[PDB]
Amino acid sequence: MPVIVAILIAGRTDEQKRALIAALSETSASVLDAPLQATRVMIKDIPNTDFGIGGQTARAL
Amino acid sequence: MPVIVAILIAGRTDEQKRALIAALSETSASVLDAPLQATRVMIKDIPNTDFGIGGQTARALG
Amino acid sequence: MPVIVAILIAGRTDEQKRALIAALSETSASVLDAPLQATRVMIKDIPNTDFGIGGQTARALGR
Amino acid sequence: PTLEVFLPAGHDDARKAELIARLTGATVDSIGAPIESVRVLLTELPATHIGLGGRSAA
Amino acid sequence: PTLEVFLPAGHDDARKAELIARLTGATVDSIGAPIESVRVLLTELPATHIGLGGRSAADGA
Amino acid sequence: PTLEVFLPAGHDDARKAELIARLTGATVDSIGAPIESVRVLLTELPATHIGLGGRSAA
Predict the structure, then answer these.
(1) How buried is residue F49: exposed, middle or buried, by Cβ count under 10 Å (0-12/13-18/19+)?
(2) What beta strand segments (E) does C1-63 contain?
(3) What SS3 state is found at B9?
(4) Ranges for the 4-oxalocrotonate tautomerase-like domain (chain E) (predicted)?
(5) Closest chain B C-alpha to E46 CA, distance in angstroms
(6) What residue numbers bound the domain in which D12 lies?
(7) Is A7 an interface residue toward E (CB < 8 Å)?
(8) Which of A52, D30, F30, F58 is in the most buried spot, having the most CB atoms within 10 Å?
(9) Residues of E known to be catalytic
(10) How many domains does chain B have?
(11) Among residues E55, C54, F18, F23, which one has the least CA distance to residue A24?
């Protein structure tokens, strides 16, 4: 622990995803005083047609 | 890997919950050939007021 | 299907939760041409100390 | 409010936009949340990833 | 009961069908759930979406 | 971004506020999302609900 599920609108680079995995894991370990090795991050991409805010899709913006 | 979130209606006993963690882990490890020691199970208990079956809450008994 | 997880800041009444569960199930069934009896809705109540928007807790933002 | 909706693949973009609009409306009407706080995440699954009663939807 | 199962990609349909079947049974036998009430939702993740101890599975964590 | 953080129960409110702020900063630092779009949901779990390698945390 912790296990972090991170849901992102599709389109980020593989490099951005790797950076996000590194940063969320090290930050969780640092704040919680917990071992880094046990952390888990799982990224889910979601298309802009599949994400809504205020009833409008991210594609509609 | 793998990571399993098990969403349950509140009410199962601690021993049912331990049995579930065990049974779900061994199964995933066996099917996927995944190492047992890496499999994560996380139980989220849901009160009957928060669980909908067919549009009716579990407390309404539908 | 569908299965809907609804994350809500804690504090809603039981009647409000029934209304939400009914409304989301009936809306999902009609739009997706699925049987109503197969729908599932799971509400996750999250305290205002455990939810953040832009790095600030819901409590700090006045709920 | 954040809704994660697990649904099968096969719906076109217009149908997903209707579902997001109508689930958002259903949320505002039923609990009074301001519309701008309602977020809908559609999680589309292939039929091979959907288990109902121990059987795969495929 | 509803199970979201996060898996790395690379497992075939037949393996996924066995997982859905065998997780459903392990749930019926563990907590006494009526079998038509067990939902299993499989989320397949690419290696670039999986972090173990702050490292991406794509880098071979 | 919507981050769901599963963590053992029992952290005090101060630690939770620090975690929420710091994970939000980490997300902005990594992917540059508009910070107001970063939502963090802490999901606290009792030790009897945490399975690691087939064994409960309890």
Answers:
(1) buried
(2) 3-9, 40-46, 51-53, 56-57
(3) strand
(4) 1-58
(5) 12
(6) 1-58
(7) no
(8) A52
(9) 1
(10) 1
(11) F23
For this PDB entry, the determination method is X-ray
Instruction: Give the CATH number of the domain where residue B36 resides.
Output: 3.30.429.10
E-assigned strands of E1-61?
A: 2-8, 39-45, 50-52, 55-56
Phi-psi label, residue A36: left if phi above 0, alpha if psi -120 to 50, beta otherwise: alpha
3+ Cβ–Cβ pairs closer than 8 Å linking F and B: yes
Residue F14, amino acid: A
User: Which CATH number is E13's domain given?
Assistant: 3.30.429.10
Total number of domains in chain F: 1
Q: What's the order of all strands across the beta sheet hosting B51-53?
A: A56-57, A51-53, D39-45, D2-8, C3-9, C40-46, B51-53, B56-57
Residues whose CB is less than 8 angstroms from the CB of residue F19 and which lie 6 or more positions away in sequence, other chains included: A28, A31, A32, F5, F11, F40, F42
Q: How many CB atoms lie within 10 A of CB E47?
A: 15
* Residue A59, SS3 per DSSP: coil
Cα–Cα distances (Å) from B1 to A1, B54, F40, in that order, read 13, 32, 23
Give the residue numbers spanning the domain of A61: 1-61
Cβ pair D3, C6 in contact under 8 A: yes
Strands B56-57, E55-56: pairing kind:
unpaired
Q: For residue F33, give the 3-state DSSP assignment.
A: coil
Residues C18 and B45: their CA atoms lie apart, in Å, by 18
Helix or strand or coil: residue D25? helix
Instruction: Please give the helix or strand (H or E) that residue D40 lies within, else none.
Output: strand D39-45
